[PDB]
Symmetry: C5
């Protein structure tokens, strides 16, 4: 005799005639109130300048045709109806690279005063400009805007639903333990117009995210200090031996191949030039000047075809030493000849020994200077890190 | 005269009016009982913190409108009808990264008392937090939650169908011989609420999986012990020869390039720091101190420009040896000069020989110390492995 | 006056009422006869344990509602109707990783006795367990099962259509000139049941495929024999020269980097351990012991700081040689001193020469032993290959 | 009593009969006016000769059946109706590689005079010919054409809507800070015909884009000048030492491996041959001739088995030096023999010294020539860069 | 009073009853005439034996139910109707790996005599057998076949539309400046039958394409001749120096790593063995025998522990030289002893000098032989290239 609640379900859907903007008067617009909450931040692609995010989105508006009195229908205040049977605004998002992949959820709440609500999850892979000038300590500011693609300001009006301060500070759900953590989501309403007599409404959410670089800092600092330490420990071997230049060029080749294979992996971009490359270039130049010093010292010490050092050089190298911290005539003729030969050989040996001593002293002094330079570089780096840590 | 069973098929579907929650009274909610069984575990992505699983899922609920007496229709108790002609709850899964790919199966059983059942396979690629602190011996605890996205607690209520102990211990179907094997699937019912006056029901299944690391253990241990053995066998060659430093730096370069090309392949993450990296750093430091010892020994042995060793040094190096386990005057003038030259050369040779002996003794002692250190490291590693094996 | 054949097309489709299992009596089940033929085998993924295949599939069953007399309708025995207007069983395939990509073909033959047939191509990417213990000479046994996901044994019954011996030996269409060639497709009917009072029917096809490894065999054998030959030819150079150890360590580094870059490319898995790795480890160990022999020989030959060899050593090294295949007193005082110095130098030279001869003899003997070992290894490898070739 | 605006919504859609080209007379064609605006330029693939772009596209035409008087319906001039209920032309784009991914936007404006408009975003990945002859300073000219695939010139006519000069200079929306920046979008109308009696209309937009190569220029110039500088600094070490050839071959191997790993990454194509490869080949040849010079100098200086240099050679090498910037008889018999031996040794030493001096002079001269050549190459390169900068 | 042309649009579509093969008599089949034109050739995958092509395809057939007199309907001869409202044959393509991605174009021309035409673009990624025996100069012959999947020969008959000679030579549209250029498209009609009493019609188009290898030829020839030239220039340095073997092994390692990293990139297959690998193996063997010659020459020249060369060897090495292009007794006793020591040293020096001269002569002769062999190889290669160029 008396059917179930469905007695009203057809009563609203008998002659609804969807596909038309539901208003009693066409002059007034329909107002849509939206709300977004972040759930997780998926990977960000610096090469393609595109990021992937996942949000829970909700909206509501007024139908003005789905109105009924609760008392007439068993106290019924709200119900759920399929979303394909009612008018739905076309609220899209700009700077999108694909339609995306998301479920349908073909249901919507409808209240007794015409208010209709829509809840949905949605994943966006979207293009924003990424700046990686300070690559490890990045703070990215990307934007996503909601707007009606075709309806103008006289048709659809965008409202923020919740208060902006509630939206800005909302960490109710967020997947931590990832590469990124968000700082805030700042909303802003704007009016967009390319030409005259045609304007639209947009709502832009600016997402601010910060990277945690501890893994990146370790992976970028450990090989560098490793090669610096091995260069320092390999500096202290005799220079006249021919293995010094081989050791230095082998270490330089190792640094070169490491730098090349890490040249584009970490700064995966085609525009930005982070300061990490500048520090790497500085380290490379330090290795180059160390190799040049080693080559010069090796060239200075070479026993064959030598000349006695010019007095002034020895006189100031001893000065900077204050701051480092019968027919018997043929018989005697032959003996005189062999003696003179031995004196010549001894003189060559003494000249070689003096040149070797000069090379040793110069090598020690230049090693001390290089150690001081490395100390200065390391202390100024840790000083800048402390300045970052304490603003 | 009398049609087939389809005489009831239209009788239930003549004026069903799908799209409305089927209840006689709107106050009571509709209860959905669900059940999941794992079938296989596909790949897990540590870089993206996402895994892929395949389950068989079933659910059932009560329609309260598809009711009939069996006796009236040729003893018919249950039938199958297309799933697009009846109301279906929107039971979704959170922490999902895509809609996924699964067939439709447009059929459902319906019993004579209104009970309706739904069976379906489904593959989920979903985001959970992976911890790889102990990378080879991982035990991952990931979660997947079933909930109604839009209907509240007053509309849909979630029930576990089978008993929790049956669900927890269920290995009826599972594809073994993979990288992972599951331990348990723990179910838990919860009530979810972000704001007030709006609450939902969720059912969370915690999947616990364990990795079998034998392949990983072999692939990570074989090159390490290979390079340790080759370092040990290359340690025992004469130090005064110049090939020792070249051999050591070549082996160090090999270890460096292997470590760099395996630096991110196995610990494919940007947060976690497994202890395998710590052991690799320890091995690298051991190689570095071995190279430093070789360089020091090479520097100590250098025949040119030497001085006699200070007595105390020789006196304690012989002490630690207890624990290692007429005008004929011009003629004689020339002969005296050449004799003195030969004495000078012999003295230099003797000094070089003494320094070489000192270097040999020190090299042998330091080799013994290094061998003892390697023995200690290897035995403590196998000891820790045994402690893991026997708790 | 008299329409075309379509006069019967509506006669069967006027009140068909699809979506219901077409039977006059609900007690008897509907029987579906299926048939599959392979067309080509696409790539197989050993890392993901998944393969891709392409088959032509056909099935037929009885409708019992699409029945007519041919004589009444211009001799018409069979026709074609859209597949969306008739009942279609939900015959799915387990161990599938995706819904796949295949066309629709919205047409089916229907005969005058109710028999209805369905033809379709379908590509499956499906998960099976791959064993690569003998990686080049693989014979893979994978399975694919057809079953009704939701209908039970009382509803749908599976039949093989053609005889099993015809299905097993069917090479009518197959794309050869690929990486794999199939041996047989063995069908087997089974009854599946997880719980009680609920059983289903499945038809499992076991596909057996064999790999042709000639390209793999060449690519795996050529570099190995290349490095063996270059090691053999580099073995025969003087040992006292310092380039021998450099040559050996360079070749060892080359083998190491080749093995590492081919460590996971060919055995692309995380479980299996093929014997090719065992042979590679054996070759590596052979190279290691060759390097150790070279280092020992180099250490044995070192002219500086030598002692005369102990008699017994020389006495058995000559034994194993049988099987390799006035004031004139100051003047004479100075002359005696210089003569004694020359005797000392000559004695050191003779000791060095004797030690060099000992090192040469030992190096030749160990080279012969190493060559014999390489010969033994190569002959036993070709012997095992012949045993494989002739069972 | 009086319904809403929907009173006209059915009035236009009661018997619209979509699917037919809406014209009162079939002889006249329907005219579609289109407009495109670039929004961003995504990645370009030089290997596949395909690019990805994102545009906002709009079009309008005349329906001639959706006509009404505003006064009759509450002043209503325009409305919005679903796009699936009206006739829509099939305006496609050639040289497309996929259907693409874009939303639907199922709404269109309709004016009271039958004018209907359609707005949509669309992303195209499309194939055009890329020329990279001057790879860093590229100016690409690609094309995209809009045409009706099936309707001929007698049915659909294409019009540009806005004036061509407005379309050509339109930077209202464009995502800068990318790899590319566009110069202009030139439109052109054309008539297309493959066979006779069948012609179509097309509208081709030529997009002109320019690359900003600063990152590419830095990444391509820094390693090159690095290796040039290290070659120059390693040139200045003594030639008789055996480490010079090792240093040169190590640097050549480094250049070779860098060139090979960058051989196809930057010029990612299979047709074009940019001039950067020509400059790299020139640098390689310079390194090769430097290595050949080093080998020749090393061969010239070799102390063992020497002959006195032919006079003419010394006489012109001193010429080019002007531009570089009793029974006592046995006793004396033995003394004469040993003296003659010492003279022979001294003569060999003097010959070796003279050859070493010759080698040193030649090495210095060739080093000066090589430095001059490097200076010439660097100055002509910077000169060509300046010519590019100032046309 | 009199409606538009749509007066006939319903007249054909009032009771069309699609889904049935439109014929007045079921005995005669329906004939479909097809035509294909290539537009561009996308990438070809040699690893997966699959290619991607893009064609414009058209077909037409006879409906026999869409017939009208033009005079009755305002001279109307042809119109356009949606393709979903009429019967469409299921003409598919075999050897396809996916459904593909193509637009719909829901429109078809219909003429007044029942002739209906369909135009569509379509991209196929399809599997054909690729032979790369002569990898740079490939001429691939792949096939694509059009057939009705389910309708037999008694239902659908395939016709070529245009004449075969017109189809074979058709370059009206084709995107040049790619990796491939097509030679011809040969059509062929065939009858296909697996079993008896069941036959179908197929139309196979054989596409013939040729590769342009200039980029491949340059990229494969430049490093090879580079390493040959550097080997030749490094051959000419003194053999007794220890850097020769290091240079040779370094160059061999460079060739090895280049060959390995290019081992599978260019011949990206698992079956074919191109002749380029044979030439690379020949070059490797040439480098190996050069290294063996260098090692033998180095072994022959070793000053320590030498014996005088056997006369015959010197006598034929001078022969092949024709074709290369009182108590004073103790005093004299000591002098005699030292003189004898000096004679012994001089004899050893002379023996070493003679052995060095022998080694130099042999090295020069073998260098000449190696140069002649390289000349022969290069000339026969350019000769074979000329034979290819002039058939
Ligand atoms: C781009 O190419 C088209 C095709 O030839 C040409 O008409 C047009 O002038 C070109 N534009 C520029 C800026 O070179
Ligand atoms: C291509 O292959 C088919 C199949 O055998 C053959 O009939 C045809 O002649 C071939 N075409 C050419 C140009 O070789
Ligand atoms: N199942 C989660 C329901 C839910 C609660 N709050 C929400 C906010 C937005 C949204 O899309 C969904 C929700
Ligand atoms: N064909 C397997 C039917 C089946 C048996 N038990 C199940 C449990 C869940 C499910 O989705 C399906 C099933
Ligand atoms: N066009 C191929 C028709 C055909 C013949 N035999 C078949 C077997 C199975 C199938 O799906 C299709 C077929
Ligand atoms: N929401 C942006 C609406 C808009 C303004 N101008 C446009 C031009 C083209 C287009 O597709 C869209 C638009
Ligand atoms: N817009 C191109 C129309 C066109 C002309 N000739 C064709 C041939 C085939 C085809 O699919 C299409 C066409």
């Amino acid at each position: 005799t008396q059917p179930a609640l469905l007695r009203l379900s057809d009563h609203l859907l008998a002659n609804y005639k969807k596909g038309v903007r539901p208003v009693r008067d066409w002059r007034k617009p329909t107002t849509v109130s939206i709300d977004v909450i972040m759930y997780a931040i998926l990977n960000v692609d610096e090469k393609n300048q595109v990021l992937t995010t996942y949000i829970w989105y909700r909206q509501y508006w007024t139908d003005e045709f789905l109105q009924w009195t609760p008392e007439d229908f068993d106290n019924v205040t709200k119900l759920s109806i399929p979303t394909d049977s009612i008018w739905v605004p076309d609220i899209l998002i700009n700077e999108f690279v694909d339609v995306g992949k998301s479920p349908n959820i073909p249901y919507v709440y409808v209240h007794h005063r015409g208010e209709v609500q829509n809840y949905k999850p949605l994943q966006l892979v979207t293009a924003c400009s990424l700046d990686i000038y300070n690559f490890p300590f990045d703070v990215q500011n990307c934007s996503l805007t909601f707007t009606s693609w075709l309806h103008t300001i006289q048709d659809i009006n965008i409202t923020l639903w919740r208060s902006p301060e509630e939206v800005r500070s909302d960490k109710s759900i967020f997947i931590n333990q990832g590469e990124w953590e968000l700082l805030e989501v700042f909303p802003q309403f704007k009016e967009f117009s390319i030409d005259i007599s045609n304007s639209y409404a947009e709502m832009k959410f600016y997402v601010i995210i910060r990277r945690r670089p501890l893994f990146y800092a370790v992976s970028l600092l450990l090989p560098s200090i490793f090669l610096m330490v091995v260069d320092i420990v390999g500096f202290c071997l005799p220079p006249d031996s021919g293995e010094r230049v081989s050791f230095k060029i082998t270490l330089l080749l190792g640094y070169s191949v490491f730098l090349i294979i890490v040249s584009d992996t970490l700064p995966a971009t085609a525009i930005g030039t982070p300061l990490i490359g500048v520090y790497f270039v500085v380290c490379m130049a330090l290795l180059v000047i160390s190799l040049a010093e080693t080559i010069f010292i090796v060239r200075l010490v070479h026993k064959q075809d030598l000349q006695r050092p010019v007095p002034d050089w020895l006189r100031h190298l001893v000065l900077d030493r204050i701051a480092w911290i019968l027919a018997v005539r043929g018989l005697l003729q032959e003996l005189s000849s062999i003696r003179h030969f031995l004196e010549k050989r001894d003189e060559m040996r003494e000249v070689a020994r003096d040149w070797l001593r000069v090379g040793y002293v110069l090598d020690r002094l230049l090693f001390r200077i290089y150690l001081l330079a490395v100390l200065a570089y390391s202390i100024t780096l840790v000083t800048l890190w402390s300045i970052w840590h304490y603003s």
